[PDB]
Ligand SMILES: Nc1ncnc2c1ncn2[C@@H]1O[C@H](COP(=O)(O)OP(=O)(O)OP(=O)(O)O)[C@@H](O)[C@H]1O
């Protein structure tokens with residue numbers, strides 16, 4: 458609402474509103490909609506097919522407001538607009554149209570066909586965002602009405618399966634709104650009022666949202682199974698490919714601290730290809746979904762090694778040892794974050 462409309466948009470939006478009005482009535486007659494005295498969509502009768510003057514002024518004004526919200530929404534998207542020229546707006550060609558596609562009046566509303574104009578990926582993205590905003594303004598109205606979501610539409614209980622996020626919306630209506638949006642944006646472009654998209658903003662949430670406030674969960678064997686000597690091996694399977702750590706931990710490990718940040722644990726972060734013990738150093742490569750990581754420790758020469766799907770993971774050098782030397786201490790147990 459805080460947005461103020463430029464005069465060139467003001468002298469463009471009345472012509473926009475009319476043009477899309479006839480766009481709407483041509484879409485209606487192409488799909489096979491007929492004129493009728495009564496307000497019955499199932500019986501295929503509606504006085505809406507006549508010109509906007511004979512059309513109910515409520516709908517005609519609603520169309521103008523509908524377009525006004527659309528203009529204010531292009532402006533609020535951060536999509537700045539430029540004026541290409543004036544003569545292409547003064548002179549707009551008209552396709553020849555078939556009689557069956559024509560209504561009772563001989564006037565052909567379909568203006569210079571938008572097929573010449575091509576939709577860039579950014580122009581499609583803003584079409585998606587306009588569709589999202591229209592759906593959201595559609596649902597704010599329904600919620601104000603008190604209509605709530607329901608798996609099956611209820612006329613009396615005011616339940617519409619339609620009140621869902623646009624991503625979850627049914628493909629039929631989503632496409633129908635999308636087409637009118639797409640044709641609306643193309644009509645805006647064909648008015649010579651070329652729109653330049655805001656720069657692509659990259660936003661990564663890094664999965665801050667989590668159960669309560671826990672960032673990670675640590676799974677380990679019981680402290681009584683600590684190994685002090687010998688050769689030991691266990692395997693860790695990665696169903697997903699995200700922030701994981703696997704390795705050997707001392708019985709003094711804190712469940713709230715990250716693996717390898719302190720001296721109590723030795724871990725391998727394949728997500729960043731990092732080996733973790735009081736710091737991170739580059740080691741090995743990254744895993745994908747389904748990769749199996751093997752962990753081997755030999756407390757005789759105090760070495761630690763790792764395998765990704767069988768092959769030995771190396772550090773920056775040619776050495777196969779993730780942690781060359783450590784102390785036996787109290788022992789080690791398998792651990793995973
Ligand atoms: N001239 C017009 N300008 C703008 N929008 C219009 C116009 N005529 C009809 N509409 C649209 O028609 C729709 C009316 O049906 P709607 O999709 O809201 O059904 P609904 O969700 O079942 O509604 P309700 O919950 O009120 O029963 C609205 O989204 C409204 O924006």
Ligand SMILES: COc1ccc2c(c1)CN(Cc1ccc(C(=O)O)cc1)CCS2
Pocket residue numbers: 477478481482505516519520523
């Ligand atoms: C979405 O902005 C507009 C702007 C202009 C016009 C329409 C829609 C189309 N309408 C017909 C209509 C009425 C109700 C429904 C419905 O029940 O959803 C669907 C179509 C009015 C004539 S021009």
